[PDB]
Protein: DNA polymerase beta
Organism: Homo sapiens
Amino acid sequence: TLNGGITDMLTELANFEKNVSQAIHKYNAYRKAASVIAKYPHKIKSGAEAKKLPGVGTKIAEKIDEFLATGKLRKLEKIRQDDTSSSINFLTRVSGIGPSAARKFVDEGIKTLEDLRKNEDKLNHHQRIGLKYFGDFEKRIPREEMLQMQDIVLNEVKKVDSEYIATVCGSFRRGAESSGDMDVLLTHPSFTSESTKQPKLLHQVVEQLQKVHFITDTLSKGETKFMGVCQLPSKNDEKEYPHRRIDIRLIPKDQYYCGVLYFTGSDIFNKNMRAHALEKGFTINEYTIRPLGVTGVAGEPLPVDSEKDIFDYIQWKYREPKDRSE
DNA sequence: CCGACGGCGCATCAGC
DNA sequence: GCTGATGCGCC
DNA sequence: GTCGG
Ligand SMILES: [Mg+2]
Ligand SMILES: [Mg+2]
């Protein structure tokens, strides 16, 4: 982290644009810039040097010069002093409260953790559970605990049906020493792009995990995506583990490679890779890679039998998961 | 100078 | 009820 | 906010 001060500044600017300004492209621009700077292997000496990087432009170059000169950004200093901005940025830290909800709450005079805790009846289900585990959800998960969680998930799935395959993706699959949460990609031969020969495939799995008291809460749930809360069991006399966020995504089995590419991320890696596919004349989602026809309409799914095939199509050398942490 | 910026699941809501 | 838009979330 | 045509 040669440029930790700069990348934090940019991240804070990104969060402002997203949470307060509701300017999603400025949000993305700041995160692309932070990410390119984060991987740059030199300690940056000026804005000019930073501007050479793709994603850093004139405005960010200027902020970088101010930051190196003084150790801070007046623009951010003012934002931090603004009560409305501060309040909105705080509320959005609760899962389920976005930029619109936060600003709505602030209008109502709901703007602190205390306010929220006395107005539960004003939150939807997702928001109520996000509030419930607010502190827990900001803790990271040591890899060792991720390993225990993996063992539990993989073994409980196996107990439901030996044909399920569950893969932990996200920062875990990228080899991180700690994860923000647990991402599980699920496949079963009965669910392909061609047919759903068996209903309740995701449900059965979620139920078993609830049955054994691993999944403790649900934020949302459909046929292919579960978003919830889980907890490791604690030993006799031991403080409980924090509650953790868990996302489970059921992907057609024949589409596993596109699925696992998606769920491995990072998010920024994904946006960069997908943007590059476009530039090369393809479109990538978690199911397929397709050609763009002359019109601008996606064609039929190209054959894919490895993650690498996807990289090949867009003329990128393969990158192991450990190298996709953008 | 601008059009485009990654792609999609679930929950909620307006309008019919 | 549905469809389509929007909010929020996943990477 | 930045990039590419
Ligand atoms: Mg994760
Ligand atoms: Mg997740």
